[PDB]
Design a protein around this ligand. Structure first.
Ligand SMILES: O=c1[nH]c(NC[C@H](O)[C@H](O)[C@H](O)CO)c([N+](=O)[O-])c(=O)[nH]1
Ligand SMILES: O=c1[nH]c(NC[C@H](O)[C@H](O)[C@H](O)CO)c([N+](=O)[O-])c(=O)[nH]1
Ligand SMILES: O=c1[nH]c(NC[C@H](O)[C@H](O)[C@H](O)CO)c([N+](=O)[O-])c(=O)[nH]1
Ligand SMILES: O=c1[nH]c(NC[C@H](O)[C@H](O)[C@H](O)CO)c([N+](=O)[O-])c(=O)[nH]1
Ligand SMILES: O=c1[nH]c(NC[C@H](O)[C@H](O)[C@H](O)CO)c([N+](=O)[O-])c(=O)[nH]1
Lengths: 154, 154, 154, 154, 154
């Protein structure tokens, strides 16, 4: 068989990031994690644009617009939705993931899903640079991989 | 990295609001909350158009049409769906959130999701100007932010 | 602010109705409820077209086609899905609500969601002209409102 | 009001059927049920084309393509998804129902949802020609109705 | 009635495969299973292109692009999402299944859903070449069937 991959060399890549202000206590650590990860992989700090939106529901809207400028190789979406007392959590999470997916689809640009969806604050901290690592770092790496792999497609 | 934000200066913005009549006991307080929030942020009362629809299922329909007039910088959707004895709640909430999201998508205009979805009346009052604040106020602020941030995109 | 509403004057309106045969014991009472409601609001009986389909899954298909004829001001969908032993209920309800919503979306014509989704026969009778009123009547009224409000949009 | 129906006269109709091989122990009885039902309603055996696909996930794909040939008055989808140990069941059922619905939508041809989704083998047998009747027969009848009703629409 | 099938002769077919790196402990066995299955069915190893993506959320993106090249008769998606402590599982699985389905839809090329979604590692191993067989092998076979069946459609 013939293998098609994407290496982790970020040199020369232009990355766009959309972060939600909601739960910034967490998302900010996600953002910084992604930044460091990108830099240590060869991406130039100036080649990184970060756009802040109120909540995760907004993330798709910004992600699509940024991707449409065709100015980026990949887009990283960073958010943190923590469940509450109502089903609000459900809609925010669904629409976010739904839109983040269709953004990449209609845009052709890889849009990495980095929205942390937990039951409580602990699980959030758990995935923002603790026990489970930093989802932001994992997303940065995936962004790089997808950008490189995307060269192999047109 | 390069940051892209949206400040909270509402001066000069034109806002459209779609409110559901259903559970108006709550939604009306959401509406007034949004209005006051907008005014105190610099938005002119005359630059605010409010459209009433039966229920939340209708909100998407009106939100899309209002956004399509391209007459608004952002659109705020206000509603309150309180769970009952059947799964009706589920469809109304899903379709509302689904449509409110696609309205902004297909329209390019930010459409703020301000539909309160609770298990009971108490949680509704809780989020319409009590313990948890007023979702209407939060949406007004988000509308302003998104409108301003949207300038940075084309 | 500037208010945009829809009054309950049905005079001159042309209404289309799609009813599911499934659970007709209930849906028929929903239909007659809507009819009477429409008439008593000024709609002429001859300005009302009713189309019957097997079940609620079919409702969206007929609703979209009727709306596309642009012959109607609003479309009322009437159905009753009562939960059973399997998850069948789920798909029928979701697809119905999903399609009824997109019908109005793609058609520009208001399509009122009048599908009663209950756990048992009692809750169905409850919402078809008993304790909880008649969802058909509520839909007729919403249809009229949406039709009138729709004049304010193009 | 003016009633629009669909009678159960299958004479002259051309029906397409898509059956999943998965759980054929059940689906085959669904298929034969639909066949007999169609024949006894006036449909000519030669006017019936049956296409087999691996599982229910594939059904939408085949149903849309068959409908697109515009060679059929209605399309019957027959499948049986029985829940297992994982959530696999969920995705297969959702995508199936989602696609079978959009097939009719985008195609204009009625596509009858005849996918049996149960918790166990017993409920499957229950709906494939036992206690609860034969969903295949019910779908055949619905297919005929929808085909005839569809004449009333363009 | 007239039957339309797809035989299991892979000779001459060109297959594309998208595998997620996430849970590669399992997915790799899925991939090898698919490969062997394809070869033993007549597919030439050189007629098989494999593309690796970070996780299942990425699978749809790659599957659509590969399908769009119109260079393949069918596309096999291979992944393994194992549930964790949060609802993350839900979004990854839904979006994956959602996208893998729409890829085939919009592309016209069959895209086989081979994403293993389990509650634990054991059920994963169970479906990757143990008690329940190898989902990769089952997908390979389905890919071949769908490719052949697809000849019958335009
Ligand atoms: O990013 C998040 N947005 C949230 N807000 C929802 C949404 O993203 C918007 O802020 C607002 O709903 C209007 O669009 C959240 N909660 O409400 O809990 C959350 O946890 N995380
Ligand atoms: O906005 C709401 N709409 C509701 N009605 C449903 C829907 O919004 C429409 O009014 C009507 O269904 C026709 O589409 C609600 N309930 O039914 O409970 C509710 O709580 N909130
Ligand atoms: O309108 C309904 N249709 C139902 N049938 C589902 C569907 O509407 C179609 O009749 C058939 O599925 C083929 O399209 C129902 N149940 O099955 O329970 C139900 O409760 N209500
Ligand atoms: O028709 C069915 N297909 C099933 N397979 C899923 C799918 O239809 C495809 O065969 C395969 O997933 C690759 O597309 C089923 N299960 O897995 O249980 C089932 O119960 N019924
Ligand atoms: O294929 C998988 N991807 C997973 N990652 C999610 C997603 O596929 C992407 O890798 C990343 O979310 C950014 O798009 C998984 N988990 O997170 O558990 C998993 O179990 N399986």
């Amino acid at each position: 068989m013939n293998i098609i991959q994407g290496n982790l060399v970020g040199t020369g890549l232009k990355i766009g990031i959309v972060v939600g202000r909601f739960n910034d206590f967490i998302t900010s650590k996600l953002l910084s994690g992604a930044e460091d990860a990108l830099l240590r992989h060869g991406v130039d700090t100036n080649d990184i644009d970060v756009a802040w939106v109120p909540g995760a529901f907004e993330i798709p809207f910004a992600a699509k617009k940024m991707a449409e400028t065709k100015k980026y190789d990949a887009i990283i979406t960073l958010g943190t939705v923590i469940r509450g007392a109502t089903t609000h959590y459900d809609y925010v999470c669904n629409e976010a993931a739904k839109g983040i997916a269709q953004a990449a689809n209609t845009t052709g640009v890889p849009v990495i899903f980095g929205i942390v969806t937990t039951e409580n604050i602990e699980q959030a901290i758990e995935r923002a640079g603790t026990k489970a690592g930093n989802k932001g770092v994992d997303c940065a790496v995936s962004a790089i991989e997808m950008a490189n792999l995307n060269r192999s497609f047109e």
